[PDB]
Design a protein around this ligand. Structure first.
Ligand SMILES: Cc1ccc2nc(-c3ccc(N(C)C)cc3)sc2c1
Ligand SMILES: Cc1ccc2nc(-c3ccc(N(C)C)cc3)sc2c1
Ligand SMILES: Cc1ccc2nc(-c3ccc(N(C)C)cc3)sc2c1
Ligand SMILES: Cc1ccc2nc(-c3ccc(N(C)C)cc3)sc2c1
Ligand SMILES: Cc1ccc2nc(-c3ccc(N(C)C)cc3)sc2c1
Ligand SMILES: Cc1ccc2nc(-c3ccc(N(C)C)cc3)sc2c1
Ligand SMILES: Cc1ccc2nc(-c3ccc(N(C)C)cc3)sc2c1
Ligand SMILES: Cc1ccc2nc(-c3ccc(N(C)C)cc3)sc2c1
Ligand SMILES: Cc1ccc2nc(-c3ccc(N(C)C)cc3)sc2c1
Ligand SMILES: Cc1ccc2nc(-c3ccc(N(C)C)cc3)sc2c1
Lengths: 55, 55, 55, 55, 55, 55, 55, 55, 55, 55
């Protein structure tokens, strides 16, 4: 076989899960957050996949 | 076989999971956060995958 | 076979898990955080994969 | 076979797990944090994979 | 076979686990932290893979 | 002061939390369950407070 | 002061939470269940406060 | 002071938490379960407070 | 002071935590379970407080 | 002072923690279990407080 990509690719066979991202956010997984009190200014309480590039 | 990529690629066969990211965040995995009190200014309480590049 | 990459690639066969990242965050694994009280200003309480490049 | 990379590559066969990172954070492994009280200003309580390059 | 890399590569065959990092953090291993009280300003309580290059 | 009980009592002052149970179940605490697949016949997957007295 | 109870009582002052139960079930606490697949015959998947006295 | 109990009592002053149980189950504490696959017939996967008296 | 009990009592002053149990299960403490695969028939995977009196 | 008990009592003053049990299970302490694969039929993987009296 032959393949040429510029990116971003994701090429496969017999594949149970696939995610391609440029951005941005993708949530595909099981996630449970239980929480009782959030205070403070300002605290990232429960972050799973996170990116902060403030300018 | 033959392959030429510029990146970012992810090329495979018979593959159960795949993630390609440029960014950005991707959450595909099981995650449970149980939490009772968050205070303080400002404290990253529970971070799993995290990136902070403030300017 | 033949392959030329610029990066970042991830090339394989018969492969159960794959992650490619430029960024950024990717969470694909099982993670359990149980927590009772977070205080202080400001304390990284429970960080699993973490990157802080403040300028 | 033949291969030329610029990096960062990860090239393989018959491979159970793969991670490629430039960044950034990737969490793919089992992780359990149980915690009862976090105080102080500011103390990295429980860090698994961590990078701090404040300027 | 023939291979020329610029780095950082990781080239292999028949390989159970692979990690390539430039950064940054990668957590792929089993990790259990149980903890009861963290105080002080500021004490790295339980660090597994850690890098601090504050300027 | 004077007190006579037959039970079950719970007598106090200045008390943040109280539970009295005869039974039966009482859930008053923070609880997070994240779960991806349960199989088998029959397996108690994730039990927190549990009592089984089958006859 | 004076008090005589037969039970079940719960007597207090300045008290943030109170539960009295004979039965029966009482749920007063924060609870998050995230779940993706339940199978099997028959498996208690995620039980928090539970009592089974089948005859 | 004077006190006579038959049981089960729980008598106190200045007391932050109290639980009285006859049964039965009481869950008042922080609890996080993250889980990815449960199989087998039949396996108690993650049990915190547990009692099995099958007859 | 004077006290006569039949049991089970728990009598105190200035007391931060109290548990009285006859049964039965009580969970009041911080608990984190992270888990990736449970198999076998039948294996107690992660048990914290546990009692099995099958007849 | 004077005290007569039948048992099981737990009598005190100025006392930070108290547990009385007849049973049964009580979990009041911090506990973290991180786990990646459990197999076999049937193996007690990670047991903290445990009692097995099968008949
Ligand atoms: C659409 C596509 C298909 C196939 C493909 N194969 C690539 C490849 C194969 C082998 C190697 N080596 C490094 C040997 C490199 C890239 S890139 C690519 C893109
Ligand atoms: C929105 C926001 C604001 C403030 C902030 N501060 C962070 C911080 C501060 C100090 C440290 N140390 C490592 C001492 C780590 C993170 S994360 C974060 C996110
Ligand atoms: C918003 C933004 C801007 C620029 C950018 N550049 C990226 C980049 C550049 C070069 C390479 N190489 C693989 C050399 C990879 C990613 S991701 C990305 C995202
Ligand atoms: C926002 C941003 C900007 C620039 C950037 N550059 C990247 C980079 C550059 C060179 C290489 N090599 C593999 C040499 C890899 C990544 S990632 C990235 C992300
Ligand atoms: C935001 C940013 C900027 C620049 C950058 N450069 C990277 C780099 C450069 C050279 C190499 N070599 C492999 C020589 C690897 C990575 S990662 C990266 C990320
Ligand atoms: C409605 C009520 C009020 C007060 C009260 N006090 C009780 C008590 C006080 C002290 C002791 N000791 C064991 C000293 C025992 C029971 S039972 C009871 C019932
Ligand atoms: C509705 C139901 C049916 C069956 C069942 N079986 C349970 C069980 C079986 C075996 C063991 N072992 C400790 C081997 C534990 C629990 S809990 C339960 C609940
Ligand atoms: C459905 C049911 C039946 C009987 C029962 N008996 C209880 C009992 C009996 C005696 C004592 N003592 C305190 C001696 C406590 C509880 S709870 C309960 C619930
Ligand atoms: C369903 C049931 C039946 C009987 C029962 N008996 C209990 C009992 C009996 C005696 C004492 N003493 C304190 C001696 C405590 C509990 S709890 C309970 C629950
Ligand atoms: C369902 C049941 C039946 C009987 C039972 N008896 C209990 C008992 C008996 C005596 C004492 N002593 C303190 C002597 C304590 C508990 S708990 C309990 C629970």
């Amino acid at each position: 076989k032959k393949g040429v990509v510029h990116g971003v690719a994701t090429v496969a066979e017999k594949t149970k899960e696939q995610v391609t991202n440029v951005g941005g956010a993708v949530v595909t997984g099981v996630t449970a957050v239980a929480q009782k009190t959030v205070e403070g200014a300002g605290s990232i309480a429960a972050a799973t996949g996170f990116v902060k590039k403030d300018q």
